[PDB]
């Protein structure tokens, strides 16, 4: 329904925004309006910052030796769900957001098909991905209006996904 359609739209729009900002392109009206529906915001970030918004960079706690294989970890997750690499590093926030959008789009299709067991698997994957990769990246974002919106959106989306799963997890 509208709620899940909105999840996909926000992930897709945020990803498109970060691709534009990576190249110092203006944010188009359609993208701006989708995000501005939630409150006043600006998109005034420069490529010099946006290029560095990668998990292996932002997560300062990551052991160096594992930072060196993290893109491989990302790619295997992506490949397992048919998601293609772009020209950006696999751990870049634009790419991680695009991956979530693809997962939610898959969920939408499975919902329309009433494929409940497969939908469950894709929702589980969304949770796994948000817990392993995207939330750790976003929790280490520096403060700015757009980035703070992403923090809030991802925090609430993580809560939604976890709440979906917690009951069955604890059934014995």
Q: Which stretch binds a copy of itself (CB under 8 A): 8-16, 32-40, 94-102, 126-134?
A: 126-134
Does 162 contact a copy of itself by CB under 8 A?
A: yes
Q: Which stretch binds a copy of itself (CB under 8 A): 11-19, 39-47, 132-140, 146-154?
A: 132-140
Does 4 contact a copy of itself by CB under 8 A?
A: yes
Find the Cα–Cα–Cα–Cα dihedral 28, 31, 35, 41, rounded to 10°.
-10
Does 39 contact a copy of itself by CB under 8 A?
A: no
Does 109 contact a copy of itself by CB under 8 A?
A: no
Q: Are 122 and 50 in contact (CB under 8 A)?
A: no
| Helix runs in the chain, H state only | 2-22, 29-36, 47-50, 55-58, 64-80, 93-112, 116-129, 135-138, 145-169
Does 64 contact a copy of itself by CB under 8 A?
A: no
**Cα–Cα distance, 26 to 23 (Å, whole number):** 9
What is the smallest separation between the CB atom of 81 and a copy of itself, expressed in angstroms? Answer: 7
| Residue positions counted in the chain | 172
What is the smallest separation between the CB atom of 16 and a copy of itself, expressed in angstroms? Answer: 24
**Cα–Cα distance, 127 to 98 (Å, whole number):** 15
Of residues 8, 10, 31, 122, which one binds a copy of itself by CB under 8 A? 122
Does 86 contact a copy of itself by CB under 8 A?
A: no
What is the smallest separation between the CB atom of 138 and a copy of itself, expressed in angstroms? Answer: 11
């Amino acid at each position: 329904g509208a709620m899940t359609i909105g999840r996909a739209k926000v992930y897709a729009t945020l990803s498109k925004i970060f691709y534009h900002l990576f190249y110092d392109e203006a944010i188009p009206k359609d993208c701006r309006e989708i995000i501005e529906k939630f409150g006043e915001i600006d998109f005034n970030l420069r490529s010099v910052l946006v290029r560095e918004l990668r998990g292996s960079v932002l997560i300062k706690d990551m052991p160096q030796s594992l930072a060196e294989v993290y893109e491989s970890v990302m790619k295997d997750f992506y490949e397992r769900y048919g998601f293609q690499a772009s020209e950006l590093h696999a751990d870049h926030i634009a790419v991680e957001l695009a991956f979530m959008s693809k997962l939610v789009e898959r969920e939408i299709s499975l919902a329309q098909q009433m494929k409940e067991e497969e939908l469950y698997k894709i929702r589980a994957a969304q949770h796994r991905f948000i817990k392993a990769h995207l939330q750790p990246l976003v929790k280490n974002l520096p403060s700015a209006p757009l980035l703070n919106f992403v923090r809030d959106f991802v925090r609430e989306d993580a809560k939604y996904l976890y709440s979906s799963l917690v009951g069955e997890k604890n059934e014995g």
